[PDB]
Design an enzyme around this catalytic site. Structure first.
Site, PDB file in Angstrom:
ATOM      1  N   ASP A  70     -24.156 -55.279  28.885  1.00 36.51           N
ATOM      2  CA  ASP A  70     -23.681 -56.637  28.654  1.00 36.51           C
ATOM      3  C   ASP A  70     -24.617 -57.254  27.586  1.00 36.51           C
ATOM      4  O   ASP A  70     -24.054 -57.981  26.755  1.00 36.51           O
ATOM      5  CB  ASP A  70     -23.669 -57.589  29.853  1.00 36.51           C
ATOM      6  CG  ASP A  70     -22.864 -57.262  31.080  1.00 36.51           C
ATOM      7  OD1 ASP A  70     -21.783 -56.715  30.789  1.00 36.51           O
ATOM      8  OD2 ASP A  70     -23.151 -57.469  32.285  1.00 36.51           O
ATOM      9  N   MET A 117     -31.726 -60.688  39.284  1.00 37.22           N
ATOM     10  CA  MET A 117     -31.190 -59.346  39.549  1.00 37.22           C
ATOM     11  C   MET A 117     -30.676 -58.720  38.285  1.00 37.22           C
ATOM     12  O   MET A 117     -30.298 -59.534  37.457  1.00 37.22           O
ATOM     13  CB  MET A 117     -29.995 -59.620  40.488  1.00 37.22           C
ATOM     14  CG  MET A 117     -29.153 -58.489  40.927  1.00 37.22           C
ATOM     15  SD  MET A 117     -27.729 -58.115  39.853  1.00 37.22           S
ATOM     16  CE  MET A 117     -26.564 -59.398  40.071  1.00 37.22           C
ATOM     17  N   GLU A 142     -23.290 -52.295  46.371  1.00 38.43           N
ATOM     18  CA  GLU A 142     -22.098 -53.191  46.427  1.00 38.43           C
ATOM     19  C   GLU A 142     -20.784 -52.444  46.746  1.00 38.43           C
ATOM     20  O   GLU A 142     -20.355 -51.601  45.940  1.00 38.43           O
ATOM     21  CB  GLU A 142     -21.898 -53.896  45.126  1.00 38.43           C
ATOM     22  CG  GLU A 142     -20.724 -54.825  44.943  1.00 38.43           C
ATOM     23  CD  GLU A 142     -20.809 -55.636  43.684  1.00 38.43           C
ATOM     24  OE1 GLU A 142     -21.763 -55.864  42.969  1.00 38.43           O
ATOM     25  OE2 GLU A 142     -19.751 -56.135  43.275  1.00 38.43           O
ATOM     26  N   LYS A 193     -16.809 -51.871  47.570  1.00 37.39           N
ATOM     27  CA  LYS A 193     -15.499 -52.150  47.021  1.00 37.39           C
ATOM     28  C   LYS A 193     -14.523 -51.077  47.497  1.00 37.39           C
ATOM     29  O   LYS A 193     -14.899 -49.909  47.363  1.00 37.39           O
ATOM     30  CB  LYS A 193     -15.524 -52.220  45.509  1.00 37.39           C
ATOM     31  CG  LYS A 193     -14.205 -52.947  45.103  1.00 37.39           C
ATOM     32  CD  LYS A 193     -13.997 -52.877  43.614  1.00 37.39           C
ATOM     33  CE  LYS A 193     -13.022 -53.864  43.067  1.00 37.39           C
ATOM     34  NZ  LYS A 193     -13.081 -53.854  41.545  1.00 37.39           N
ATOM     35  N   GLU A 206     -19.196 -58.614  48.253  1.00 45.09           N
ATOM     36  CA  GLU A 206     -18.514 -59.587  47.399  1.00 45.09           C
ATOM     37  C   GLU A 206     -17.280 -60.124  48.109  1.00 45.09           C
ATOM     38  O   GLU A 206     -16.487 -59.390  48.684  1.00 45.09           O
ATOM     39  CB  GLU A 206     -18.047 -58.955  46.132  1.00 45.09           C
ATOM     40  CG  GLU A 206     -17.313 -59.904  45.194  1.00 45.09           C
ATOM     41  CD  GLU A 206     -17.175 -59.352  43.797  1.00 45.09           C
ATOM     42  OE1 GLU A 206     -18.271 -59.103  43.251  1.00 45.09           O
ATOM     43  OE2 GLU A 206     -16.078 -59.114  43.287  1.00 45.09           O
ATOM     44  N   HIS A 215     -13.922 -58.432  47.530  1.00 32.32           N
ATOM     45  CA  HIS A 215     -13.902 -56.996  47.879  1.00 32.32           C
ATOM     46  C   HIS A 215     -13.477 -56.804  49.299  1.00 32.32           C
ATOM     47  O   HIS A 215     -12.639 -55.938  49.495  1.00 32.32           O
ATOM     48  CB  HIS A 215     -15.233 -56.276  47.606  1.00 32.32           C
ATOM     49  CG  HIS A 215     -15.524 -56.313  46.123  1.00 32.32           C
ATOM     50  ND1 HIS A 215     -16.642 -55.653  45.629  1.00 32.32           N
ATOM     51  CD2 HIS A 215     -14.856 -56.827  45.067  1.00 32.32           C
ATOM     52  CE1 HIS A 215     -16.631 -55.806  44.314  1.00 32.32           C
ATOM     53  NE2 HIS A 215     -15.574 -56.492  43.960  1.00 32.32           N
ATOM     54  N   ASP A 231     -22.297 -61.840  46.324  1.00 30.49           N
ATOM     55  CA  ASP A 231     -21.441 -62.203  45.197  1.00 30.49           C
ATOM     56  C   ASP A 231     -20.285 -63.051  45.783  1.00 30.49           C
ATOM     57  O   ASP A 231     -19.520 -62.536  46.630  1.00 30.49           O
ATOM     58  CB  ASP A 231     -20.835 -60.999  44.529  1.00 30.49           C
ATOM     59  CG  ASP A 231     -21.787 -60.326  43.585  1.00 30.49           C
ATOM     60  OD1 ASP A 231     -22.820 -60.833  43.239  1.00 30.49           O
ATOM     61  OD2 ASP A 231     -21.423 -59.186  43.202  1.00 30.49           O
ATOM     62  N   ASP A 242      -8.092 -57.068  42.072  1.00 31.22           N
ATOM     63  CA  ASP A 242      -9.297 -57.891  42.191  1.00 31.22           C
ATOM     64  C   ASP A 242      -9.076 -59.074  41.246  1.00 31.22           C
ATOM     65  O   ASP A 242      -9.042 -58.856  40.027  1.00 31.22           O
ATOM     66  CB  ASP A 242     -10.456 -56.971  41.937  1.00 31.22           C
ATOM     67  CG  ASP A 242     -11.829 -57.572  41.876  1.00 31.22           C
ATOM     68  OD1 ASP A 242     -12.225 -58.541  42.563  1.00 31.22           O
ATOM     69  OD2 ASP A 242     -12.593 -56.976  41.063  1.00 31.22           O
ATOM     70  N   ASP A 284     -11.014 -62.147  41.137  1.00 33.24           N
ATOM     71  CA  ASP A 284     -12.257 -62.793  40.708  1.00 33.24           C
ATOM     72  C   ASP A 284     -12.053 -64.294  40.420  1.00 33.24           C
ATOM     73  O   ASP A 284     -12.551 -64.710  39.355  1.00 33.24           O
ATOM     74  CB  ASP A 284     -12.818 -62.079  39.476  1.00 33.24           C
ATOM     75  CG  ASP A 284     -13.395 -60.709  39.718  1.00 33.24           C
ATOM     76  OD1 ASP A 284     -14.087 -60.496  40.716  1.00 33.24           O
ATOM     77  OD2 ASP A 284     -13.177 -59.764  38.912  1.00 33.24           O
ATOM     78  N   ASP A 306     -19.742 -63.995  40.914  1.00 31.64           N
ATOM     79  CA  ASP A 306     -19.225 -62.816  40.157  1.00 31.64           C
ATOM     80  C   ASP A 306     -17.700 -63.065  40.138  1.00 31.64           C
ATOM     81  O   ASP A 306     -16.937 -62.620  41.032  1.00 31.64           O
ATOM     82  CB  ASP A 306     -19.603 -61.512  40.817  1.00 31.64           C
ATOM     83  CG  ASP A 306     -19.122 -60.240  40.173  1.00 31.64           C
ATOM     84  OD1 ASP A 306     -18.460 -60.396  39.116  1.00 31.64           O
ATOM     85  OD2 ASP A 306     -19.397 -59.108  40.645  1.00 31.64           O
TER      86      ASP A 306
END
Lengths: 390, 390, 390, 390
Positions: A53, A84, A177, A179, A213, A216, A241, A251, A253, A288
């Site tokens: 990123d 993090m 994490e 999912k 999350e 998720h 998250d 998903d 978000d 997130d």
């Protein structure tokens, strides 16, 4: 919103260009430095990122180095911290069958190297948590992946990472994490539960926890609040998250609280109205999420603030809910706190219990079976506080 | 069907009167002695029951005593065993908010007594496993149940059961049965993962495992075979309940293989085409299903036989799949077995990995990312084996 | 596979480069002439496409013309036809809020223009059906879209397209393709049912039908076969897209029969074992799927052939099923065909029904309710045919 | 709550004894006259019932007659009306394969007579709507039911009912109630869309509409408000059943607003803030819910009142929402109302559209594509209103 609120945002969140599975990007790229300034401004205390990123996959050390220096400046000037970091083990085609669990041995060696490197940068910027999202670990077909072998290989990689961090004295905590799917047909460690069970098998389990999350767990139609409660009982809630989702579908978000609003409320209540006034959770409250594809940069900043807004409005109502003597009375009537008293008297064992006639022989199940718990009423009081009608 | 196949059925499967949430019973009660006789006849090696399925709730000792002797005689005559027993902690109104985790302390005390009693009977009949289905443990509203306190109390109760079993020399193994919902809005320990993680926290964890049910994982849209693989990896697969389901909707309890057929196939392959050549799982293959409400007693016996027939048919095709040279070739091309080779070379740590330029600095990710895994072709050969097309 | 099977494929199917929501394309671009060649070779009888699949968005007239001529030559040489064409109204940023129902009126007008142009090209290549997929029609937020107004605008656009086609004498039929979500949070006309109800309100409804896709109905956990049976009842099955899906999750686009195998079986049975021996459906059997991201060009042709092999293997088993005397006997015991006999005798109306004591006053509901339908056995026989065990 | 609010409840809601699929009733039966009195007292304007809720299945005429007369007196004295009636075609074992669509011809004949008899009683109590819930029309196995024959038989029964009503001058309107599953594996006419498309095929479509229920569409994870919007566009919303559900799982029947709160909010906005100030719907606001199994009769009345409170609180918030000049400004920026303006200019046709270079040739797709719609911001203001933060 105060730094004490600990709201953090991933650079890939506000930075999402809105290129979905069915269309091209609708927004231009966001400059990291700018993101740093904007977030600082809306009240965030920290920012997170995936290696790729901040530094484009494949940048020389010179470029790589330059970028870090500038980013470091921005944190400096603004006072934002990096609580993090995480590694991108999903975008490049080489990771098409996973990083750590790719069937190809070379890809597994490479994925570890990629993470060690990110661990270095993380340590340099003061990050305390390494989040591991195994988005490509899993399969589309059952015969294609030996899950047992896969778990052995996930474990082998993680054990190495803890070895290194402990030896280099980084003091990182690792957060797996969960999912259930997307992008693979099925992902390994599909829920908060599977991720916790797995971590208990590592070499230094105390260094490992989960980063659950919202969306998720909701993709499998699970109760996110109840799952967090379990994670808290285990003491494995290392990070979290927050976002929004509408059940089992891709998903989404969405902004935190824009999906299952009732669960968003019970969640803030759980995290905040901890034992003895104090929060039950102390880490970052990380968002997130993705600004909807239909929005522009204006829409982007809006959505960033909506997250904070939603959390603070819910907190406010969760506090008022608990403080209300009528709720207090309804809690009593529903015996919510009676679950905290041990079932057994002090020093009581099987023998004493077997000898207690009132627990069986002389117990009137029919009579107790008829008393109501008053749960609908307690529930209605909660929603009225949520609605600001009380 | 051989005794070596170990097919077992619950008394409550074939004996289900088909009284559902929206209608009256369409079948008369099945006599237990009759059930033992009919099951012996279709090839079952064992039978299981909840206390209340054999001895009606509230039977006086004379009565209870009489039933057990008749039952043991039937066992005797047919050569059927009782591999597992369980307790009904869900029917009676007293259990409306749970047995071990009811908000009411007196119900919790009664719940333990009801189980100790069932333990004695199981011990008496030679049962090796105690299945615990916490069907009423959970909630409809988040503010009604303190999940943390609930886990404490679930733990308190299990620790006691193990203490008792151990003192008495019963040699029982305890298998927690996960379910996401129904009858409660959300049930505690909703997936195989949550249950494994929980068990890892008891006083004598070696004594605890899980009893995952096909349909229960499918109610959340999870990959059943993949969660069983994980259970086996942890060595916590103490029992298994086989049936069929069509995704997330009420619990259907169809015949094994009548819901997700592809996953039924991959499951049989996993359990049977184990490590040596040998099965990866050695316990009972238990069918926890329900003969459809549209059926009479001829339908009931047909459905019992269908369960065993589906298993043996899938087993035969799983075997053939693995023995096919073309499959061996496809497995080689997809690198399935390469996942079993450690990522690291013997004696290699992070220092040696970091020194390997080929794992990163000189790694050609683009080239590797362009080769295909041939997973579709492997899946196509599997399906053709399933269809007897090869 | 013969040309009479009428297997067709979209150019975007075998041409999917595998750029998903979370990663880059794993395959290079496929040349359209090559695609025509490759498909002709595996047995397809026709090819389909979105405007934009063939001619790059923003192609000068010259280029566009250039592409078309080469494409026609290829069809020429190969013998493949273009049975259906479709328009891309989902990729470019301008359509982020939809094409036909964008809140922005300029977008709606542009969307219409874009379709008329494809209709021209379609008419020119001999296509008979225009499939309309409103993937961007919908919303993420309820207050953002006036559904009633959106339906008015959807209708207004379709009425015009029919008007044009009729006046230019193109002889096209229009097939609306329903999808519940993805990419919009909620898409308008989410199921085959909503799409049929809508079509019925158009100006020349006889020109409109639907193009249901296996995966789309399964994304909502609906019974695809049953919805298709409803569509045929209404005479609205103008086209059909076949693929596989594993319930409510992101759109997988697996090979037909690689998702819900039991429902793929019953679907083939319904389309082929039509009344009068003959298929109940005579249009194209189009595969709208995606070769998995883990595959290379070989996996791509493998996956194309798998679609055809799956349909033909299921067809063969559906006929054997229907031809089996024991099945014939189970159908009779299940009274499947008795549903085809009117409830009322010829000439009977409510007056005569009311006069029949045997239909109410003297009807023994209890004796009827006790007889079983033999459905489990019938299901067991279907499956045994599917497994090639009979 | 005023009588003008038109809140109605089914006798079977507050009268549910709480016998679920896994346990015994937790409540004693509720007397219908007592239920009439209690309902009137909490503000209900009407009561509804299935034949069998009021008059026990198999009551002799003297018994039946007495019940009805007592019932009518209560109605009289309280001033409550009976706006809708329904028939139980699902409880008795005879209906195990359905009512109107059972494979067994005699059952189909009896089902129609059971309904005719309820229509008479309905017409005599002044009911204007007959709701048809085909809970048992469907299948667990694909081969067990010919859907086409099933739809034929469904239509055949409905045509007769319309005929009889029209002939007797009853003036009833018929509302089919869709449900995806439960109690059958798959139910015919699974969503509001499927039922609307079917109704359009009856002999007198104008007498037919639907009775959609909140939880039923949510059982398929569909947007209830959006499907209601479509029903309103078709003008087929004859009645509505309000309750709560948590996505795809068994039918929960929670109090309205206790499931998906945000969708409950946008539903109340759609119904009351209709076109021209006035409600978009004027039929009863019926609560088809069940008091949780954990409650006693106090909890039952609390839950009846919670339904009405829930509706009035959301209505107040919906009104404030729309009267907010900031909300209006956001609506304008999001261009919500611009969808209500025809896409075509008055008198413009395809010829003129083809002529407008501004709709294509000179369209700057790229520039339009870059403007944000401000949907997030609009959603945020909607939730701040619901939260009473505004």
């Amino acid at each position: 919103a105060t730094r004490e609120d600990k709201f953090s945002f991933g650079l890939w969140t506000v930075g999402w260009q809105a290129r979905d599975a069915f269309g091209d990007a609708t927004r231009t790229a966001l400059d990291p430095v700018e993101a740093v300034h904007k977030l600082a401004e809306i009240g965030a205390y920290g920012i997170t990122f995936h290696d790729d990123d901040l530094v484009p996959f494949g940048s020389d050390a010179q470029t790589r180095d330059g970028i870090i220096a500038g980013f470091k400046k921005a944190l400096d000037e603004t006072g934002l911290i990096v609580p993090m970091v995480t590694t991108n083990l999903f975008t490049h085609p080489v990771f098409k069958d996973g990083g750590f669990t790719s069937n190809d041995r070379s890809v597994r060696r490479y994925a570890i190297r990629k993470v060690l490197r990110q661990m270095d940068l993380g340590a340099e910027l003061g990050a305390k948590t390494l989040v591991l999202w195994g988005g490509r670990e899993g399969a589309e077909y059952d015969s294609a992946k030996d899950v047992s072998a896969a778990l052995d290989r996930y474990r082998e990689a993680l054990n190495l990472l803890a070895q290194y961090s402990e030896d280099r004295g980084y003091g990182l905590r690792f957060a797996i994490e969960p999912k259930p799917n997307e992008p693979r047909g099925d992902i390994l460690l599909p829920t908060a539960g599977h991720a916790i069970a797995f971590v208990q098998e590592l070499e230094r389990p105390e260094l490992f926890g989960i980063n659950p999350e919202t969306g998720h767990e909701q993709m499998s139609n699970l109760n996110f609040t109840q799952g967090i409660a379990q994670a808290l009982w285990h003491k494995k809630l290392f990070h979290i998250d927050l976002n929004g989702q509408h059940g089992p579908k891709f998903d989404q978000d969405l902004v935190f609280g824009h999906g299952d609003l009732l669960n968003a409320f019970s969640l803030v209540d759980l995290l905040e109205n901890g034992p003895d006034g104090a929060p039950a959770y102390d880490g970052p409250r990380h968002f997130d999420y993705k600004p909807s594809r239909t929005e522009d940069y204006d829409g982007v900043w809006e959505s960033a603030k909506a997250n904070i807004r939603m959390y603070l409005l819910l907190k406010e109502r969760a506090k008022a809910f608990r403080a209300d003597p009528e709720v207090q009375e309804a809690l009593a009537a529903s015996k919510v706190a009676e679950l905290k008293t041990p079932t057994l008297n002090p020093g009581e064992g099987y023998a004493e219990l077997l000898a207690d006639r009132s627990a069986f022989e002389d117990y009137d199940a029919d009579a107790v079976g008829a008393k109501g718990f008053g749960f609908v009423k307690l529930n209605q009081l909660a929603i009225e506080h949520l609605l600001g009608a009380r």
